[PDB]
């Protein structure tokens, strides 16, 4: 199936003293494999998945050097942006950046990304054609004009379509035992009497990967959204994910309700029903 590689960067200014707090993380699909925290002792890009530990010294040296360069750019940006928005030097602000590439089911470049945010809102983003920019306001417009003149889009395009895809393919092969394996959700249902006449049926989906999944409730073969509750997909902590959906029903009529589970790891959707 399709796969992706993404890098997330966050820098928070600390006006009271010192430089911004900078944190960077790298992911392949829903698996984190590297990180950098300016607050940590190593001051180096660090591994977070076993399959990336195969890389030699030159890899870690280059990645460390580059992530530090990323850090400084963000430090400068915080200053530049404080001026663009005419803000005080006494408050703390945030800049975020995210970029990456996707390969399709054919394993060929599918698409690339490069977006930026200031204080949690879109600032500037590269469009899908990887040739134009989307600026959210006049501060971003100034940046856009400068990046057009410096041809930053062309440079990012060469990375996203080349280096990015090539490395994503390399990581996929090296960590194939996990990255190219889908973990079908382990499902079951629980029954909870909320009163003498009503009961809650909760449909569980556990230990699945990737995170993408859909849980739906039907009553007498027809989708039901009322009297239901769906929680946000959450990380188990061991690399897999969890989710559940519940419905309140009249005691004694549990048999009319079915929970439908769709996930890439299942040849066909599963259907659960209570006793």
């Amino acid at each position: 199936g399709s796969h992706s590689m993404r890098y997330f960067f966050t820098s928070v200014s600390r006006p009271g003293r010192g430089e911004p707090r900078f944190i960077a993380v790298g992911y392949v699909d829903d698996t984190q494999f590297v990180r950098f925290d300016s607050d940590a002792a190593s001051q180096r890009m660090e591994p977070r998945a076993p399959w990336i530990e195969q890389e030699g010294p030159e890899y870690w040296d280059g990645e460390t050097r580059k992530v530090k360069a990323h850090s400084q750019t963000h430090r400068v940006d915080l200053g530049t942006l404080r001026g663009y928005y005419n803000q005080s030097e006494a408050g703390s602000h945030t800049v975020q950046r995210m970029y990456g590439c996707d390969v399709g089911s054919d394993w060929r470049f599918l698409r690339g990304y490069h977006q930026y945010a200031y204080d949690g809102k879109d600032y500037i983003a590269l469009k899908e054609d990887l040739r134009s920019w989307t600026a959210a306001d006049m501060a971003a417009q100034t940046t856009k004009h400068k990046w057009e003149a410096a041809h930053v889009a062309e440079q990012l395009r060469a990375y996203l379509e080349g280096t990015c895809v090539e490395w994503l393919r390399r990581y996929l092969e090296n960590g194939k035992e996990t990255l190219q394996r889908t973990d079908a959700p382990k499902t079951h249902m629980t029954h909870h009497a909320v009163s003498d006449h009503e009961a809650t049926l909760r449909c569980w989906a556990l230990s699945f990967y990737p995170a993408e999944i859909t849980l739906t409730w039907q009553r007498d073969g027809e989708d039901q959204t009322q009297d239901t509750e769906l929680v946000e997909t959450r990380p188990a902590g061991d690399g897999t994910f969890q989710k559940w959906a519940a419905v309140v029903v009249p005691s004694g009529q549990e048999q009319r309700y079915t929970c439908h589970v769709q996930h890439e790891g299942l040849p066909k959707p599963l259907t659960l029903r209570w006793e």
Binding site: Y7, G26, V67, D77, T80, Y99, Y123, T143, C164
Partner: peptide, 9 residues
């Protein structure tokens, strides 16, 4: 692998 160049805003 990370990009090699990062232009300022």
């Amino acid at each position: 692998s990370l990009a090699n160049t990062v232009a300022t805003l």
